[PDB]
Structures are given as C-alpha cells and as structure tokens.
C-alpha cells in the first residue's frame, strides 16, 4: 500500500540548450537520469513542475511533448493571472513519461509555448499571440527550482 | 430555492452568416432573443451547446467570445476523439452571457476555431494546425440541434 516520490531534475544547460532552441522555455529532461524507478509498470503518476514570476500581465501558455524536430504533441494549457506572488504550476504528464520509460533515448523533452488565436478568412490569415509578452521573462530556469519531473512509482513489489 | 432553465436558440442564417465569416463555425446569438430572463443578477449559469459528428479524426478546437471585428477573447478548448457516435459538447460561458445581459446589442457571438501549435525560432515561424481537417465538417449548424445557449436564472424573486 506504499509508493515512492522522486524528483527527476530537468537539466543544466550543458546540451543544445544554452539560451536557444525560439520556442520559449523548452524543457529537456536527460532521460539518462530516469534511473529513479525506471519501470513503466510501477509508475503511478508524474507531473512536470514550473516556477514562474510574471506578476503584471496575463500569460496563456501550452505544454507540448517532443517528437522528431519541428513536430510536437499538444499536452495542456494554462491561464496565468498577473499574480503578485511567484507560483508553482503542474502538468499531469504521466502518460508521456511512462512512454519515455517503456522506450526512448538519453534526452527527451517538453516545451512551453505562447497560445495563438489562429484564424482565417478568404485570402487572409490572422494570428494573435496571448503569451510571453517579453524569449522569456516568466519561468525560473536555472538554480534552485529549475524545472523538474515529480514521479510517483511503487518499488520492490506491486503484489 | 427554485430556478429556471431556458433554451436561447442561436439563430438561422438570415444575417451576415450564410456560410461565410473563414473562422469555422461562428456562433451568432441574436441578443434580441435574450428576452428569456434578461437580468444579470438572476442569471445563475449558462452554457454554449454544440452537436458534432466527426468520427474518424481527432479534432482540437477552441471557443472564443466576440469583440470589435478581428479581435477575440479566448474562452476554452476541447480535445475531440474520433468518436463513432455524434456527441454534445458544452462550454461554461456564464460570465460572457452575463456581461451580454448587463450591456450589449442585438447580435452577440462566439466562435470555434482550430487549435494552432504556434512557435518560432530565429528568422523562422511554424504553425501546425490540429483541428478542422476538412471550412467545416464537424458541428450541426441548422435545423434541430443547431447551436444554442442553455441559461439558468431564478425569476420572480431571489430573496
């Protein structure tokens, strides 16, 4: 009747990540560090975790899973008030990180991206953008509270 | 301890609506027919209601409130499975239709729009589109089950 939490820290910018892709605040979890209970059968939950500090403008963001370059899977969306206090956001990414256990390489990734009101009319396009009125002034990306995965899995048995 | 439901039918295409804007499946509720309990203080809830029939491709849509032309407020988003059966969707639009009671004209409107994975890199843009793989093969727009508002308000007193 027991379970284990784990804090899979995202990374430090030692990879193709030093302030470029730009798709704003791309997360690259070094799957080499899914050492923390790697079994997809034991995994019971997992969340992507953000810390943000925008306090004067509404921000509308979306979370995506990575595929072969310039191809993404939409996962979720958030509506961020001009909150005076910094705040922690969480996205349920259990399925994604489970698939990243049953297979995958040494780096996998998510990304945030501003929301676009995208529409068209005959012979004309319009794309309003509703997020990241800044390539980034929103999330804390290095040091304490750098993005991370919170994974909950049951080890040593599940009978 | 009592309340009243009302079915404010959207419209028939007798306005600038006969199969053009194109932003797919724009809803234009003729506010002249908010005769149904028009008081914003009595309004307790309201929902925009859709009937859809796409059964082979995932569709990702968004609901928007209308402003001065080519300017919109994002309201919600839906992830539609390739469901064999047609299905009814509902969006909580209480605030929007309440503001449309405390003020507004004779026509107000919402719209659906396909979701766009919008991102950028230095000197390049990319916009994938995740909905309406068709300008419309998804929602029933005329006859029985044409879009409508479901509004719940308490009449004749609220003491």
Swiss-Prot record, chains A, B:
Residue numbers covered by motif Cell attachment site: 135-137
Localisation: Secreted, Extracellular space, Extracellular matrix
Modification(s) after translation: N-glycosylated. Deglycosylation leads to activation of Transforming growth factor beta-1 (TGF-beta-1); mechanisms triggering deglycosylation-driven activation of TGF-beta-1 are however unclear.
UniProt superkingdom: Eukaryota
Region annotation Bowtie tail: where it falls in the sequence: 119-143
Spans annotated as Arm domain: 1-159
Carbohydrate attachment residues: 29, 69
Result for mutant: residue 145 to A: Does not affect integrin-binding or activation of TGF-beta-1
UniProt free text on domains: The cell attachment site motif mediates binding to integrins (ITGAV:ITGB6 or ITGAV:ITGB8). The motif locates to a long loop in the arm domain called the bowtie tail. Integrin-binding stabilizes an alternative conformation of the bowtie tail. Activation by integrin requires force application by the actin cytoskeleton, which is resisted by the 'milieu molecules' (such as LTBP1, LRRC32/GARP and/or LRRC33/NRROS), resulting in distortion of the prodomain and release of the active TGF-beta-1.
Assembly and binders: Homodimer; disulfide-linked. Interacts with transforming growth factor beta-1 (TGF-beta-1) chain; interaction is non-covalent and maintains TGF-beta-1 in a latent state; each latency-associated peptide (LAP) monomer interacts with TGF-beta-1 in the other monomer. Interacts with LTBP1; leading to regulation of TGF-beta-1 activation. Interacts with LRRC32/GARP; leading to regulation of TGF-beta-1 activation on the surface of activated regulatory T-cells (Tregs). Interacts with LRRC33/NRROS; leading to regulation of TGF-beta-1 in macrophages and microglia.
Protein's UniProt name: Latency-associated peptide
Originating species: Homo sapiens (Human)
């Amino acid at each position: 009747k027991e379970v284990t939490r784990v804090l899979m820290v995202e990374t430090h910018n030692e990879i193709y990540d030093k302030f470029k892709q730009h798709s704003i605040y791309m997360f690259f979890n070094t799957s080499e560090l899914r050492e923390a209970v790697p079994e997809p059968v034991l995994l019971s939950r997992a969340e992507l975790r953000l810390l943000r500090l925008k306090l004067k403008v509404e921000q509308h963001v979306e979370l995506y899973q990575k595929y072969s370059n310039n191809s993404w899977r939409y996962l979720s969306n958030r509506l961020l008030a001009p909150s005076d206090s910094p705040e922690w956001l969480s996205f349920d990414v259990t399925g994604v990180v489970r698939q990243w256990l049953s297979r995958g390489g040494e780096i996998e990734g998510f990304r945030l991206s501003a929301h676009c009101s995208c529409d068209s009319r005959d012979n004309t396009l319009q794309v309003d953008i509703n997020g990241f009125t800044t390539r980034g002034d929103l999330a804390t990306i290095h040091g304490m509270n750098r993005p991370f995965l919170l994974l909950m899995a049951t080890p040593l048995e599940r009978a």
